[PDB]
Amino acid sequence: TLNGGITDMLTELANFEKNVSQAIHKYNAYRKAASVIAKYPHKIKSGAEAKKLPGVGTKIAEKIDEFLATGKLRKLEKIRQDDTSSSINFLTRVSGIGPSAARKFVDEGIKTLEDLRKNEDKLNHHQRIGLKYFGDFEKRIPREEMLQMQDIVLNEVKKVDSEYIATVCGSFRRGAESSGDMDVLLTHPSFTSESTKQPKLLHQVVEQLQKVHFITDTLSKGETKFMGVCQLPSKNDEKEYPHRRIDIRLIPKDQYYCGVLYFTGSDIFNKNMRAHALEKGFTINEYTIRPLGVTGVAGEPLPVDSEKDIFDYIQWKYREPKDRSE
DNA sequence: CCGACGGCGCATCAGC
DNA sequence: GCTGATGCGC
DNA sequence: GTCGG
Ligand SMILES: Nc1ccn([C@H]2CC[C@@H](COP(=O)(O)OP(=O)(O)OP(=O)(O)O)O2)c(=O)n1
Ligand SMILES: [Mg+2]
Ligand code: NA
Ligand code: NA
Ligand code: NA
Ligand code: NA
Ligand code: NA
């Protein structure tokens, strides 16, 4: 990409701040800067030029000037040489192992893949599955496979009850040619913001997907959110497809628009949009958009009849999903 | 200068 | 068991 | 780390 060296540097700094420093606002600041730089249509010549962008300040501009002049950043070169930072950064690549658990494992002498592989009994369920599919989870999913996965999910959901509607969201809905995982929004007329008329709505769908061997493992599961693993079936003599992460979120049917806005993302787009809503006097979650003034107490849910209605409330021109990849 | 940083689901734990 | 905090996740 | 109040 046009300013790939710069965005890569900022992303690595963001990851260091989240995983090692345990400084979430620096992690978010670096990612916000990387995002705005990624969409800038010019090859950046200086930190001063980048500083004109919202989210890029004095310190990142200084880093951009060093990176452009030398092709490196001394701060990262030192971080890369730090054993504790390297160990923590590695451990956090396992799903379920965050900054806290990574540092605790390092303290206990568990810091390599081999260490993890002989210490499964020291991992929780999620971490154990994250270790089992360490390599598969770092592989991307081509859109062709995402289409095959979409077919299986939509068809199996239909077999359970023709009234369910499953919508693939995330990067897929934004039109990405490759995705990190599969995000599925699910609705059923029996579950609305007013009542839940049938129990096990998410459970029956998870069960059916497990029955046809599509869903292979479970990381966490509740009444409205499933987080697990799935795998496309392979043909005779064919090498198996990698196991993939899949998230399914059952949202009240009458709140589909706020739900699909949320699940489509991106994550940075949502943070940016929700922050703009706050400045405009509103608060947005996956269920509703409500006013929120100076008193600091949220009001009643406003009528939403399209994703566009949410953008209108906050005085933003509508952006198609493909234009939300921040 | 300095307060705030999007919003919430599930797993795991400690206090009562 | 219930509740609220924390960790990790979307 | 960056921003607006
Ligand atoms: N911090 C987060 C993470 C996720 N999401 C929402 C928007 C994206 C959606 C699914 O999350 P991911 O699967 O992580 O995002 P993605 O855009 O689908 O990217 P990827 O292709 O890597 O799956 O959930 C969010 O609002 N806040
Ligand atoms: Mg995704
Ligand atoms: Na700026
Ligand atoms: Na992790
Ligand atoms: Na083994
Ligand atoms: Na082993
Ligand atoms: Na996901």
Description:
Strand 8 and strand 9 form a beta hairpin. The chain starts with a helix and ends in a 13-residue tail after the last helix. It has a five-stranded mixed beta sheet, with helices on both faces. It has a two-stranded antiparallel ribbon with strand order 1-3. The chain has a two-stranded antiparallel sheet with strand order 8-9. It has 326 residues and is an alpha+beta fold. 48% of the residues lie in helices and 12% in strands. 2',3'-dideoxycytidine 5'-triphosphate binds next to helix 12, helix 14 and helix 15. One sodium ion binds next to loops. The structure holds three DNA strands.
End-to-end gap: 15 Å
Oligomer: monomer
Supply the CATH architecture of the largest domain.
Answer: 2-Layer Sandwich
Can you list the ligands bound to this structure?
2',3'-dideoxycytidine 5'-triphosphate, magnesium ion, sodium ion
What is the domain tally? 4
- Share of residues in strands: 5-15%
If you consult CATH, what is the topology of the largest domain?
Beta Polymerase, domain 2
The geometry reads as globular
Pairing-aware structural class of the strands and helices? alpha+beta
| Secondary-structure element series | HHHHHHHHHHEHEHEEHEEEHHEEH
Tell how many strands the DSSP assignment holds: 9
- Radius of gyration, whole Å: 22 Å
